[PDB]
Design a protein around this ligand. Structure first.
Ligand SMILES: O=S(=O)(c1cccc2cnccc12)N1CCCNCC1
Ligand SMILES: O=S(=O)(c1cccc2cnccc12)N1CCCNCC1
Lengths: 386, 386
């Protein structure tokens, strides 16, 4: 009875205050229906607690507490809106996940890892989660807004010189090392998940496919994840059964990224997705550099050292061998201070809602239930306030 | 988000810590079944929380934490056991209420009033609740043990002189005034619910039929409650529809009690229950004193002043007129200090488990559910620790 004063207040615990309230609020939501109320055990309880619960729901953060300035990202289960909290006047990126889409698709437990990393990472390399809440229809994540836009946008607006490519690649290696040292492998390293902040420095903004490492730093997984252009050969092959791999899969993606940034195209580009999988499986033959592409000796060397089978890939003896590669040799920054040195592309913003670095972008209730189905159960424990 | 640090810690609130845990524990219990787990919303949630919940259940007070010395009372839904807490070695009376009997009988919300009064009354006239807990099968209430036994037992072991009858009646009036001043009318005032403690002083030990008063001190009720011998005429008639009455119904029972204690029989005794109801409805004619019964002028006067229709009953202008009745005139105590004066019958106990003042006294699982039925829902919020 001693430890509970601890557990309840510990933000990491699954049974803290906010989670206990989520439960009691999800229970009332999932039981208050016409048919269900014919049962009396249910109708009684809904009597005692329904009033007090509706009052508590009044003190809960709400979507209405925010103005939707505009949509800046689109997800598989919702969008990411640029918003301004009405009372504070502060701006944030707010991601929405539809409870109905996740339930219908039977994919209602993929967000825990992301929620945890963005909330507790406490790292300059990870987009920060200020608070997470929910209503009967959606899940909400209020995060720090990254006005710099992603790297897919930076790569299409500038012809990137090696000086920049070193900078970004170095920050990507540091961001992933931070994630690995938290016990996770990313598995979806790509330009779309890399955002630039107000100063032009990098942060990872998506962790939907992260996974907790072993006691050896490895994971057992039989599902190929990540965008086709960036899936490493070991992750691709794990789709055929008994995949066992470590963080080296993120290092492969860095190679694809560096290639794409300096060559202008992804190394295993193909007109079909299956075409790309095939190139990847046959990387020994399929990788090749364009004749007119002008790339330094070291740059081409680093790309080839990442783009090989795991057993001989750069980083197989630790991140230290990646950091000492000659391609990173320079006079502006070192591995300890890169984030406090001038970024290559400093954003030029005209206001707290300037979303010029983001391309523009262009409603299904649950069927009232017969008997209890528990559709709010998977989201008990999502709520979070710093 | 400010008030919650309050609510959660306020023992009176329905959504405090212990209640939030009851919910999350009742939910897991009511969802963890073979058939129910075929649904995935349920199976997922039962995965995330089932482990942590079973650990928390380990830190919960348990029936095994107590030795059952013997059964001292029997209830409609369970028994009252004399027990010793194993670790502390302290003795208590522990009442058990079967969840299955309450559910089957559809009477799973009658205990709230009692739980509240015994837990928060903080009065020398009310048996005290130290803690309430529960397991999947029972509800438990750990109360202070009253070794003196009840007044049904005292009346059958002694021929009670008026000196004593004043003492007990005065303590009964004070105990009920305490209950009324809490905003409740008792409605089951009888010798069985009156217990004597270690010193021989009185306390009320049952509040199963209490009801919150109006803003006028009255209640609207259409159900006759209480044991037949003690039901007042207004409570009996309310069974026929539109009952509206106040605390005067408790004063009537005091009259029945005083009569029984001095005459040796209840005033409206009959061989059948229906016989007794009839006498009560016809109290103007049915009340009469035995020829050989020797009762003082004042004693007989008080009995008759209580045993009349409400409109002319003693106490209709407040408890003050009851306390100043001449029958209570005496040299041992006054209304302010009666509880700290020598009791008439001081218990002679040989140990902390002496239950000689209590007569001796001489298993049905719920059918595994098909779909959710929620049988643990009515008891969410029962848990309580001082
Ligand atoms: O650019 S996002 O809208 C975005 C995500 C998270 C935090 C953000 C903060 N600021 C702007 C955009 C943000 N985004 C989601 C959809 C595609 N995947 C990765 C990035
Ligand atoms: O005597 S009890 O067992 C009892 C109740 C509550 C607290 C007690 C404390 N000590 C002894 C007996 C007690 N009891 C229950 C059954 C019949 N109704 C009223 C009294």
């Amino acid at each position: 009875q001693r430890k509970l004063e601890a557990l309840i207040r510990d933000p990491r615990s699954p049974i803290n205050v906010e989670s206990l309230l989520d439960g009691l609020n999800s229970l009332v939501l999932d039981l208050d229906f016409p048919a269900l109320r014919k049962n009396k055990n249910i109708d009684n309880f809904l009597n005692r607690y329904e009033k007090i619960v509706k009052k508590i729901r009044g003190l809960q953060m709400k979507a209405e507490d925010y103005d939707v300035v505009k949509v800046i990202g689109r997800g598989a289960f919702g969008e990411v809106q640029l918003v301004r909290h009405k009372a504070s006047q502060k701006v944030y990126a707010m991601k929405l996940l539809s409870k109905f889409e996740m339930i219908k698709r039977s994919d209602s437990a993929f967000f825990w890892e992301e929620r945890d990393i963005m909330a507790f990472a406490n790292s300059p390399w990870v987009v920060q989660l200020f608070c997470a809440f929910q209503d009967d229809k959606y899940l909400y994540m209020v995060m720090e807004y990254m006005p710099g836009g992603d790297l897919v946008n930076l790569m299409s607006n500038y012809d990137v010189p090696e000086k920049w490519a070193k900078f970004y690649t170095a920050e990507v290696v540091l961001a992933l090392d931070a994630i690995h040292s938290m016990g996770l492998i990313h598995r979806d390293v790509k330009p779309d998940n890399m955002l630039l902040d107000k100063h032009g420095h990098l942060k990872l903004a998506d962790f939907g496919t992260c996974m907790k490492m072993d006691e050896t730093g490895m994971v057992h997984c039989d599902t190929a994840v990540g965008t086709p252009d960036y899936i490493s050969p070991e992750v691709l092959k794990s789709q055929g059964g008994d995949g066992y791999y470590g963080r080296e899969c993120d290092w492969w993606s860095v190679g694809v990224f560096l290639f794409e940034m300096l060559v202008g195209d992804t190394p295993f580009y193909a007109d079909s997705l299956v075409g790309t999988y095939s190139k990847i499986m046959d990387h020994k033959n399929s990788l090749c550099f364009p004749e007119d592409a002008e790339i330094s000796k070291h740059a081409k060397n680093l790309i080839c050292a990442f783009l090989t089978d795991r057993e001989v890939r750069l980083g197989r003896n630790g991140v230290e061998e990646i950091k000492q590669h000659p391609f990173f040799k320079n006079d502006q920054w070192n591995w300890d201070n890169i984030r406090e040195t001038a970024a290559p592309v400093v954003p030029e913003l005209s206001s707290d809602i300037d979303s010029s670095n983001f391309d523009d972008i262009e409603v299904e209730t649950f069927p009232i239930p017969k008997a209890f189905v528990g559709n709010q159960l998977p989201f008990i424990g999502f709520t979070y306030y710093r």
